[PDB]
Write a protein that binds this ligand. Structure first.
Ligand SMILES: OC[C@H]1O[C@@H](O[C@@H]2[C@@H](O)[C@H](O)O[C@H](CO)[C@H]2O)[C@H](O)[C@@H](O)[C@@H]1O
Ligand SMILES: OC[C@H]1O[C@@H](O[C@@H]2[C@@H](O)[C@H](O)O[C@H](CO)[C@H]2O)[C@H](O)[C@@H](O)[C@@H]1O
Length: 266
């Protein structure tokens, strides 16, 4: 069952940073279901350095994310990347995700993002690390795609008001659109998930039964087409509030969630 998830997204509380041992304990709980995790920032809580130590001690692999929005974050994250290359083994890194939903938010223009990606690639390619960026299905302009090794899609049919019966079918449809913008490069999925509590979004209903269904459907669909998927997310995160506090496969105290069965639908 350590093949059930290709990988899993792992959240971090910036106002209450973990330790190496605390990360090791967290990743340990996940080991029966996966061998791979993903972090969202390099410098924040020094999380990238600590997660490399934790994954390596446990024999696991990792995707490393760079968090860029405000102008200063471009300098800070690049300096953190340089420190990582000098202070860490990186042989267990499957990719570097340069920004997440940068174009969706309008943090910067397409040409500027392409230039930053180009600089990142020049630094890590001799270390043997492939580069991507993550964004919504309608935000992959050619000028950005030209600089990538591969593409990663964030897509949540829940935030689209899509009903649970149609949700995984819609995910796959959005995937086909990213392929259309891919220039023939490989396409992966960096994030999708479904909340267990916190109300509804139009016809999209939040419940334990629905998260269970969505998990089964997506795992089946990506297996049929040989698509690599990072599920969102590992544990519930209360400090986000409301619906955003209920995306975990497991609970906030690292116990299992009653009603969730971890398995693929085919
Ligand atoms: O802590 C770094 C940045 O994290 C951002 O939230 C992330 C979300 O975009 C993503 O979808 O989920 C992960 C894990 O739950 C979050 O870390 C914040 O929005 C940023 O303000 C923050 O700098
Ligand atoms: O609350 C805003 C959230 O919006 C999400 O983007 C949505 C996509 O996931 C979804 O597939 O499409 C719709 C537009 O058709 C987007 O709004 C982000 O993924 C979240 O990070 C964000 O919090």
């Amino acid at each position: 069952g350590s093949q059930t998830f290709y990988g899993i997204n792992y959240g971090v509380n910036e106002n209450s940073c973990p330790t190496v041992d605390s990360m090791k304990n967290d990743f340990n709980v996940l080991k029966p279901y996966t061998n791979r995790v993903r972090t969202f920032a390099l410098s924040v809580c020094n999380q990238a350095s600590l997660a490399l130590a934790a994954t390596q001690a446990l024999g696991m692999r990792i995707y490393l994310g760079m968090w860029i929005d405000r102008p200063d974050t471009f300098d800070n994250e690049m300096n953190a990347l340089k420190n990582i290359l000098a202070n860490n083994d990186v042989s267990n890194v499957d990719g570097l995700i340069v920004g997440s939903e940068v174009l969706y938010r309008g943090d910067t223009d397409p040409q500027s993002l392409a230039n930053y990606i180009k600089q990142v690639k020049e630094l890590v390619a001799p270390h043997g690390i492939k580069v991507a960026t993550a964004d919504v299905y309608y935000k992959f302009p050619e000028v950005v795609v030209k600089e990538l090794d591969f593409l990663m899609m964030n897509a949540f049919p829940y935030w689209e008001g899509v009903t649970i019966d149609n949700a995984a079918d819609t995910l796959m449809s959005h995937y086909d659109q990213v392929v259309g913008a891919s220039l023939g490069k490989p396409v992966k999925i960096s994030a999708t998930g479904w909340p267990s509590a916190g109300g509804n979004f139009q016809s999209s209903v939040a419940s334990v039964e629905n998260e269970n269904k969505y998990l089964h459907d997506v795992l089946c669909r990506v297996k049929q087409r040989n698509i690599d998927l990072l599920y969102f997310s590992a544990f519930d995160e209360p400090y986000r509030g409301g619906v955003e506090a209920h995306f975990g496969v497991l609970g906030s105290d690292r116990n299992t969630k009653p009603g969730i069965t971890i398995e693929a639908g085919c």
